[PDB]
Every structure is written in C-alpha cells, then in structure tokens.
Design a protein around this ligand. Structure first.
Ligand SMILES: Cc1cc(Cn2nc(C)ccc2=O)on1
Length: 119
C-alpha cells in the first residue's frame, strides 16, 4: 500500500524500454527536418525522453498520467504511419505490448494503495 512506489517502478520500466532496440525511434522527439509534415498529422508529439524528464521533474502526480503520455507515443506512431506494415509502426506495436505487460501491476498497486489510504 505504498502510494509513492509507482515512481521508482516507472523509472525502472523506462530504463528497460531505453535498453530495448524497439524504442530507438521513440527515444527523442520525431525529427521535423526528416518528416516535415509531422505536425500537420500529429497535434501532441511525445517521446520517452520527455516522459522520463517529466517523471524526474516531479511533474506526474500518478502512474495513470505517465501511462497516458506513453500511450500517446504509440497512438502518434499509428496515426503517422503510411502503412500498418511499416518498420517504425511495427516496432511501436511490440514496444506497446511490452509496456502494457509491465505497467498493469504498477497501475493496480497504485490504485489499491490509494483505495487503502481512503478506506
Ligand atoms: C516515431 C516516429 C518516427 C517516424 C518517422 N519515420 N521514420 C522513418 C525512418 C521512416 C518513416 C517514418 O515515418 O514517425 N513516427
């Protein structure tokens, strides 16, 4: 029932994501010089360095907020892909499965801890 435990758990999961080869296209903001129409398709760019920085700055109140930003990385990849068979989009689907597999217990533990706090 540790209300704060999610933060270190998210730091560790981000470290695992950074060591994954599938995260390479998502580690830094999408290069607007290489994809000049990116902002015509994507309203809110997101990447894993921005997520890690937001977490380290103490600018996430809960793992749900972190999860919303990570999911935005994947939805942006899906929205920008010209094909569901593209390399970057295919990497995003594997990385998303890995993320969802690991974030589930973090969210469950946090919500359980908060319910215990308000019992
Ligand atoms: C994340 C992310 C990276 C890209 C942009 N992109 N990158 C390459 C190498 C080829 C096609 C292409 O669309 O789009 N979202």
């Amino acid at each position: 029932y540790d209300i704060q435990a999610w933060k270190k758990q998210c730091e560790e999961l981000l470290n695992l994501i950074f060591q994954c080869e599938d995260s390479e296209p998502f580690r830094q903001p999408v290069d607007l010089l290489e994809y000049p129409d990116y902002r015509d398709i994507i309203d809110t760019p997101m990447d894993f360095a921005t997520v890690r920085e937001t977490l380290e700055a103490g600018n996430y109140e809960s793992p749900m907020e972190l999860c919303k930003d990570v999911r935005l990385i994947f939805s942006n990849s899906k929205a920008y892909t010209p094909s569901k068979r593209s390399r970057i989009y295919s990497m995003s689907l594997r990385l998303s499965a890995f993320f969802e597999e690991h974030i589930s217990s973090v969210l469950s533990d946090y919500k359980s801890a908060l319910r215990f706090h308000k019992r």
